[PDB]
């Protein structure tokens, strides 16, 4: 018939360069799942916590490592429903680029467009902005790239960053550590070790999920493979 309810601003400016209600959203991604992203400089590899901690996981396509398109993949930390819309929206955006350019959407561009809805939800009454942060990968310009889009809509540029449990501590360890000039196989080994540092508990292959982006294209690594990398390194 019609709906009203809540249509006045719910968000008030705090002197910090951010609003109060968005700041709270960033704590939400912190209590979210561990996800790590490191740019290997010959592809980008992104790794995420497979589990939602029930430890019955049986993945064959239900992943949180998802190809949007030919060379873009997304792994996230935070909310499930909020993420599904970003994935559906991302394909429409990538393709929007694919129609005009005949190449899909660069990392920078995809970020600008996803970011505008996340802010929209803030300023408006009767909505709340996402609780999701994205680790976005891509191969554009002849270089691998990795961007971080936060639940606010702000963007921070990162060659390596960590999300989930102990995210803050995660960023400083990466800032010092981050590597480049890595072979594909090595890319996986470094990524898994960084995931060990963020994520607690058991890792086997139904606890962590890995996806790689390189020249051939983004794909999502089979549960057998992840296991071989995990064992290999200290």
């Amino acid at each position: 018939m019609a709906e009203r309810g809540y249509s006045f601003s719910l968000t008030t400016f705090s002197p910090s360069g951010k609003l109060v209600q968005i700041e709270y959203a960033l704590a939400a991604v912190a209590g979210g799942a561990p996800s790590v992203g490191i740019k290997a400089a010959n592809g980008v590899v992104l790794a995420t916590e497979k589990k939602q901690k029930s430890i019955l996981y049986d993945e064959r396509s239900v992943h949180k490592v998802e190809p949007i398109t030919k060379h873009i993949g997304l792994v996230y930390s935070g909310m499930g429903p909020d993420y599904r819309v970003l994935v559906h929206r991302a394909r429409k955006l990538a393709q929007q680029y694919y129609l005009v350019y005949q190449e899909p959407i660069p990392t920078a561009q995809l970020v600008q467009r996803v970011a505008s809805v996340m802010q929209e939800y803030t300023q408006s009454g009767g909505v709340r902005p996402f609780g999701v942060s994205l680790l976005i990968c891509g191969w554009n310009e002849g270089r691998p790239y990795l961007f971080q889009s936060d639940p606010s809509g702000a963007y921070f540029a990162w060659k390596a960053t960590a999300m989930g449990k102990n995210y803050v501590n995660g960023k400083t360890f990466l800032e010092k550590r981050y590597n480049e000039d890595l072979e594909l196989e090595d890319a996986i080994h470094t990524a898994i070790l960084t995931l060990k540092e963020s994520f607690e508990g058991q890792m086997t292959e139904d606890n962590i999920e890995v996806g790689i982006c390189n020249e051939a294209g983004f794909r999502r690594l089979t549960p057998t493979e992840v296991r071989d990398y995990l064992a290999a390194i200290a």
């Binding site: 010092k176 590597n179 000039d181 890595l182 072979e183 607690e200 390194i233 200290a234």
Partner: protein, 211 residues
């Protein structure tokens, strides 16, 4: 990619085919070439070079080839330029230390290494080398030296620290000072160790010392 593809085959071949005294000669020449290499990634090539030489470290033995070969691991270490790499090298060092050679050789190889890590590159590698030298010193009964090496470092790596590898120097210090019979110093090293270590997640070896 070169370290694995030709170098390992050539080293295995010289040893398999012609005698242990005959191969030593080939082996010297192969390590000299290694400096330059023919690498297509400094990262990978260095991790594998250090690993293949590392077969010799384990014995440890007292051969002519053993002393000279040890010298090669040091420029190769500086060139490696990866954090993950440090743990690998640590392990090879552990094996050099378990099986004893002469007193003098073992101490000098580790001393020289500490200084080069500092020259060419980061404090992070300088620190890792240190854990081993201090370990070996308590056995040698060169305490006085162990005390100077460990005490000096602590302030410098403090502003760097967010990383797992640094705790280990602190762990080792405590043992050496406690054997030394300096309980304040042992207790001091302990003080630093549990605050820095946070949670276990760190390499199985690292967890093994922390507990």
């Amino acid at each position: 990619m070169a370290a694995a593809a030709v170098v390992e085959f050539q080293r295995a071949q010289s040893l398999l085919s012609t005698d242990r005294e005959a191969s030593i000669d080939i082996l010297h020449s192969i390590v000299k070439r290694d400096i330059q290499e023919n690498d297509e990634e400094a990262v990978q090539v260095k991790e594998q070079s250090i690993l293949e030489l590392g077969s010799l470290l384990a014995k440890t033995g007292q051969a002519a080839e053993l002393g000279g070969l040890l010298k090669y691991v040091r420029p190769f270490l500086n060139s490696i330029s990866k954090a993950k790499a440090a743990r690998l090298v640590r392990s090879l060092l552990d094996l050099f230390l378990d099986m004893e050679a002469a007193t003098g050789q073992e101490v000098e190889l580790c001393l020289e290494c500490i200084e080069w890590a500092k020259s060419e590159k980061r404090t992070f590698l300088r620190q890792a080398l240190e854990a081993r030298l201090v370990s070996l010193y308590f056995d040698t009964k060169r305490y006085q030296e162990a005390l100077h090496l460990g005490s000096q470092l602590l302030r410098e790596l403090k502003k760097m620290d967010d990383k797992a590898l640094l705790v280990e120097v602190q762990l080792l210090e405590s043992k050496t000072y406690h054997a030394l019979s300096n309980l304040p110093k042992a207790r001091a090293a302990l003080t630093s160790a549990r605050t820095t270590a946070n949670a276990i997640y760190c390499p199985p070896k690292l967890q093994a010392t922390l507990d």
